[PDB]
Amino acid sequence: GIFSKLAGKKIKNLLISGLKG
């Protein structure tokens, strides 16, 4: 998912955002 890197990262950016945050 090259061009989808941002697509697969954002969807999982919630866990890393609600984890330490």
**What are the start-end ranges of the H helices in the chain?**
5-19
How far is residue 4 CA from its own chain's centroid?
A: 11
Q: How was this structure determined?
A: NMR
DSSP 4: T
6: which 2 tokens? 């941002």
User: In whole angstroms, how far apart are CA 9 and each of 5, 6, 15, 21?
Assistant: 6, 5, 10, 17
Q: How far apart are CA 4 and CA 1, in angstroms?
A: 5
Query: How many CA atoms lie less than 13 Å away from 14 in the CB half-sphere?
Result: 4
Q: Return the sign of the alpha-carbon dihedral for residues 12, 14, 19, 21.
A: positive
Q: How far apart are CA 4 and CA 20, in angstroms?
A: 25
DSSP 3: T
Assess contact for 8 and 1: CB atoms under 8 A.
yes
User: In whole angstroms, how far apart are CA 11 and each of 3, 6?
Assistant: 14, 8
